[PDB]
Every structure is written in C-alpha cells, then in structure tokens.
Amino acid sequence: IVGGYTCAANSIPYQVSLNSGSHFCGGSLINSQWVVSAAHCYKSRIQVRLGEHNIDVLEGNEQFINAAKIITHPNFNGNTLDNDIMLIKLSSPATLNSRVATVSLPRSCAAAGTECLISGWGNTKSSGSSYPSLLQCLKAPVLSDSSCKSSYPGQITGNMICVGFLEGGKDSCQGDSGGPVVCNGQLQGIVSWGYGCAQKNKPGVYTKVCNYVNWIQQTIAAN
Ligand SMILES: NC(=[NH2+])NCCCO
Ligand SMILES: [Ca+2]
Numbered sequence: 001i002v003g004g005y006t007c008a009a010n011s012i013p014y015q016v017s018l019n020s021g022s023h024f025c026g027g028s029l030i031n032s033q034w035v036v037s038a039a040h041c042y043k044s045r046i047q048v049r050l051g052e053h054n055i056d057v058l059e060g061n062e063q064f065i066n067a068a069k070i071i072t073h074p075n076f077n078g079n080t081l082d083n084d085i086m087l088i089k090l091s092s093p094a095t096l097n098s099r100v101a102t103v104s105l106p107r108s109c110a111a112a113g114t115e116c117l118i119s120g121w122g123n124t125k126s127s128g129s130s131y132p133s134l135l136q137c138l139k140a141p142v143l144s145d146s147s148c149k150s151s152y153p154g155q156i157t158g159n160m161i162c163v164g165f166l167e168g169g170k171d172s173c174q175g176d177s178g179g180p181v182v183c184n185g186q187l188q189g190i191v192s193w194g195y196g197c198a199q200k201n202k203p204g205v206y207t208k209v210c211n212y213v214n215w216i217q218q219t220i221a222a223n
Pocket of ligand 2: 052054
C-alpha cells in the first residue's frame with residue numbers, strides 16, 4: 001500500500017497473509033473454512049496466516065492454517081486479468097473471534113464514489129521497494145466507471161472496478177495482490193492489477209466481487 005497508514009493491530013480481522021516461505025499475497029476470510037484471493041496469486045502450496053499484524057513477529061493472535069484446496073476461477077484469463085479470483089479452503093476451520101473474523105460478500109455492487117478500505121503488506125514506496133512488517137491501510141473511493149475505462153482504454157471488463165486516486169500517490173501495489181477492498185462492510189474488490197502503482201492516471205484495478213457471489217457460494221457448497 002502506497003500512501004497509506006498503519007492499520008490498528010487486528011482492526012482488519014478478515015485480512016489474511018498468504019505465505020509460501022514468506023508473505024506473497026493477501027486474501028480475505030469469507031467463511032470459517034474459506035479465503036478469497038486473486039487467481040494471479042496461485043501457488044500449489046499455501047499457508048494461510050490469519051490474525052496477523054506484524055508478519056515478522058509472533059504476537060499471539062495468529063492462526064497458521066495450510067490450504068487444503070486452491071480453486072482458481074475457471075474463466076481466469078492471465079492476459080486480460082478478467083476473472084482474477086481464487087478460493088482457498090482451509091485444512092481446518094479458522095477459529096472466529098474479535099481478531100479473526102469473516103467479511104460479508106456484497107449484497108449489491110457499490111455506487112461510484114463509495115468510500116472503501118484497502119489493506120495489505122505490499123510495497124509501500126512509489127519509487128523503490130519497502131515491504132512492511134505491519135499491515136497497511138488506505139481509504140479510497142470507487143472511481144467513475146468512465147474514469148476507470150479512460151485510464152486503461154479497451155482493458156476494463158464488466159468484472160473490474162477502479163478504486164483510488166487519479167492524482168497518484170495512494171494505491172495498492174505488488175504484495176497487496178489478492179487482498180481486500182471493503183466498502184460499507186462488504187467485500188467489493190480484490191487487489192488485481194494496474195500499471196505499476198500510485199502513478200498519476202493509473203488507478204488500481206480490482207476484481208468486481210459483486211459479480212461472483214454465486215460462483216463463490218456454489219464452489220463453497222461443492223467442496
Ligand atoms: N495498482 C496496482 N498495481 N495494484 C495491483 C498490484 C498487482 O496485483
Ligand atoms: Ca505476527
């Protein structure tokens with residue numbers, strides 16, 4: 001997260017870290033047994049780390065649970081990034097408490113201008129690299145579906161939204177991938193793609209979660 005602030009510890013209780021020797025992507029806990037993330041985050045072996053704030057120190061609220069199943073969207077396209085969504089089944093249920101909690105899926109799509117919270121352990125520098133120990137947070141609005149489409153001509157499908165700031169300096173980045181965009185208590189976005197990060201007129205593009213609730217529920221019920 002570039003241009004963000006350090007979240008209060010455990011204040012984003014649905015945020016997970018996907019780990020494969022180190023942190024590599026975010027995700028969101030949506031059921032005691034299921035995390036949703038981005039298909040471009042796929043790895044065949046993943047440990048889900050719940051209840052984190054400092055990913056470099058055991059602080060006592062962590063639950064480390066291996067992925068039992070990893071299911072990418074059958075229509076994920078690695079070129080266009082359409083359908084950039086993935087589900088991970090935990091090998092045991094997360095134990096839900098104040099620090100490890102589910103986030104609601106969308107009841108509807110979010111209006112343009114809706115304020116959202118984007119979070120993750122991704123790069124924090126707009127130039128160079130600094131990867132944080134502590135979870136970072138960013139408040140950002142859903143952008144006009146036009147301001148999104150003008151930024152990336154011909155590249156925004158109906159399964160993508162832009163959330164962010166056209167002036168730059170405030171965006172998700174590498175390592176935030178797969179993490180949450182939560183607006184009015186609902187998971188509306190998954191960190192997906194962009195052109196670098198925090199550049200002027202290149203806002204973050206996010207998988208539009210309100211199109212996937214049936215896919216999510218059907219996959220959960222079948223697996
Ligand atoms: N604005 C961004 N490039 N964010 C997405 C990072 C790549 O998943
Ligand atoms: Ca920790």
